[PDB]
């Protein structure tokens, strides 16, 4: 669904230029890939209600940031170079698969197993891991609050510090784990991680909030108009303790 929204927002941008008839570069706008960051959904499921059938589903999380990890580089476009004719190439990574060329593309070369991978000339991506702790207001009595791993990409890194209440509303993906560091086997358990899409604190800024209800605001102003506000709120804060006014 997000991939469709990224394409519909591109066609709507071109329609706004023709309707306005501006003297701007149309090639510089169409080449820019726009991304949609949905947040504040209705499915506000916690970390304990993470049912197994919610694989790859955008679920809003309301927790607290525990620690912060440094930015880890993530390779996106690989860079290859020959060792004989020195032919630089650029092969993009698709689904985490680095398809290395078997033979050189040059006609004068054409030597198998002659391409060298240069990691210093590759386009890396920003990747930050944030450990989120469960909110104690939703944890039942007698249970310990667990944690979860978050993955922040794009330019949203370095925006959440330790001791900040944010609202993560991203997809619920999962990556498999390996039983050994030297073998290609995989365990039965899958490491679950939430891909962060938007960061709403409780970069950019919130333009407005739509909390509570406007019908409750009329009742709030009704009590404020009464002269006995200092005595009504003093009794409701502790109706089980006598005196102590």
């Amino acid at each position: 669904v997000i991939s469709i929204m990224d394409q519909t927002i591109k066609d709507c941008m071109v329609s706004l230029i023709v309707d306005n008839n501006l003297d701007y570069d149309l090639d510089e706008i169409e080449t820019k890939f726009y991304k949609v960051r949905p947040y504040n959904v209705g499915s506000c499921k916690g970390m304990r209600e993470l049912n197994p059938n919610d694989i790859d589903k955008l679920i809003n999380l309301k927790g607290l940031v525990l620690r912060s990890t440094p930015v880890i580089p993530d390779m996106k476009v690989a860079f290859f170079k020959c060792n004989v004719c020195d032919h630089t190439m650029a092969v993009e990574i698709d689904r985490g698969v680095i398809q290395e060329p078997a033979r050189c593309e040059r006609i004068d070369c054409n030597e198998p197993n002659s391409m060298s991978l240069i990691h210093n000339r590759c386009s890396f991506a920003d990747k930050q891991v944030i450990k989120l702790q469960e909110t104690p207001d939703f944890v039942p009595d007698g249970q310990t609050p667990h944690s979860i791993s978050l993955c922040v990409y794009d330019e949203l890194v370095d925006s959440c510090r330790a001791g900040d209440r944010i609202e993560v509303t991203g997809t619920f993906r999962s990556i498999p784990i390996r039983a050994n560091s030297r073998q290609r086997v995989l365990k039965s358990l899958y490491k679950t991680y939430v891909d962060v899409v938007h960061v709403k604190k409780v970069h950019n800024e919130v333009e407005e909030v739509r909390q509570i209800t406007d019908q409750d605001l009329a009742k709030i102003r009704e009590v404020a108009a009464r002269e006995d506000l200092y005595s009504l709120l003093a009794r409701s804060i502790a109706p089980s303790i006598y005196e102590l006014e």
Binding site: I55, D56, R95, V97, Y190
Partner: protein
């Protein structure tokens, strides 16, 4: 299609009560609450009863059962039951054309079940609802 992919229900076996076990005089061991030390070598694979205190309750981790690999060339879904990921496609379109496509694991096409570890020591694996 594998039969485990369409089975959305979790079958359970409830032990017999103390009232029905008195009339049945043919090995009434499944109805008696046995202990951990009483588990010998002949109780393997038997429906016994363990009574104790649950300690160290783990979280709910989704456990996969049938992993489906979606190819990129032919586009076939290769199902594999879990009791090593598949990289080469086993379809007839990739073998006749001599083009072995890379099998991509689809998380949405794989069925995941609940899994929780508990210690009573004896490890207890809870699966399902």
């Amino acid at each position: 299609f594998p039969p485990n992919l369409t089975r959305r229900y979790f079958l359970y076996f409830k032990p017999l009560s103390q009232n029905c076990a008195r009339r049945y005089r043919k090995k009434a061991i499944s109805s008696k609450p046995l202990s951990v030390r009483q588990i010998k070598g002949d109780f393997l694979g038997q429906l016994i009863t363990v009574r104790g205190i649950i300690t160290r309750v783990s979280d709910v981790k989704p456990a996969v059962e049938v992993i489906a690999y979606t190819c990129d060339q032919c586009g076939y879904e290769v199902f594999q039951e879990v009791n090593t990921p598949l990289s080469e496609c086993t379809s007839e379109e990739c073998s006749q054309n001599q083009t072995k496509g890379q099998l991509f694991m689809s998380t949405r096409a794989s069925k995941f079940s609940a899994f929780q570890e508990c210690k009573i020591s004896l490890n207890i694996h809870v699966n399902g609802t």
